[PDB]
Amino acid sequence: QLLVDRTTNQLYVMLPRPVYNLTSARLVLGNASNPVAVSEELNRISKGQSIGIPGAPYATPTGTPASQWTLCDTVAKPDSSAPKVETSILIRTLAIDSGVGPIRADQGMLVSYEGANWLITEGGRHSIDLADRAVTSAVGIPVTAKPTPISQGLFNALPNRGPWQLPQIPAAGAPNSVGLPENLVIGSVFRTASDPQHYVVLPDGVARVNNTTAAALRATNSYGLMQPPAVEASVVAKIPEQVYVSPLPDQPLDVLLRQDSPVLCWSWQREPGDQAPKTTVIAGRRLPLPANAIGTGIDQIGGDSTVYIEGGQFVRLQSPDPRVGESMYYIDPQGVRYGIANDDAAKNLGLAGPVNAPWQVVGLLVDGPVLSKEAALI
């Protein structure tokens, strides 16, 4: 039995005692108890000690589940001695437009993390050794390029999709044993007669190669071979086929500049059915949001993150590590993570149907206490 005080707004739970919060009183009774409007009936009677969790939220008001979970990285000015980064965690439906849209397939950005340069592309990130000057010239990074800083939260979210390093050619500099003209050396490139194709020379044949990789292969070695020589369409068939596993892209990459693109976001959207959440990479002038919501940034007490959440959430997280299972977490409207020990206890708060949220974004939220029946008595 729960009694709401008329003027103090204090809650008393009766079992065989006052309670800090409505969550604490609903957890202990084993049911989502609506409190009676009793004030002289408890103030004139016996009192006790304050039970319940203090760190827990007052109530658990879930709203419509959030469509997108997004990490946003904002760099006010790249041209600085040491630039500052502001992290925004948007747990709401995103607003896309001409100013802030998702990055194109042939588009990327340069970022510096822990004294290393990374190249944030469409689906992830790649380790670029900016000293590999010929490679950066083939990809499209200008000589006047400079990387900017990037958040740890955003860096972990962006999948590492391998470095942009040409694979070493084991018999480099050796003469062509395949029978191709003596000008062609092993570690060289050949062109052929709509769109022409480039081939790289290897010890046991030749392999096809995109323009970015052909450019970089010639610029890193050359071997005195000015311009790629032409080969017929037939002479290449007698020579065997090999596969160069070059990570470089086909079209040269347009490098976004932070002075034009001050916000870099990564976004996760749970999809229906057996689909895999759609992860998009977004860049722009501002945060991907409507103007009306620009003022509601909840600065996190215990974190360098500004939370733009809309209503409470009930979520389930599945980690790929087997030693880590799957966990339910309640997120209040302030954007604070509160773990839930079990299904029975989730039913005592009126929380049903936890939706899937990412570990990438939910891990960055401040972790408050756990909503267990056992943890109330303290």
Author numbering: 75 to 90, 96 to 117, 119 to 273, 276 to 460
What did the study's authors say about this model?
The ESX-1 type VII secretion system is an important determinant of virulence in pathogenic mycobacteria, including Mycobacterium tuberculosis. This complicated molecular machine secretes folded proteins through the mycobacterial cell envelope to subvert the host immune response. All ESX gene clusters contain at least three or four ESX conserved components (Ecc), named EccB, EccC, and EccD, with EccE being present in all ESX systems with the exception of ESX-4. In this study we report the molecular structures of the periplasmic domain of EccB1 and the cytoplasmic domain of EccD1 from the ESX-1 cluster.
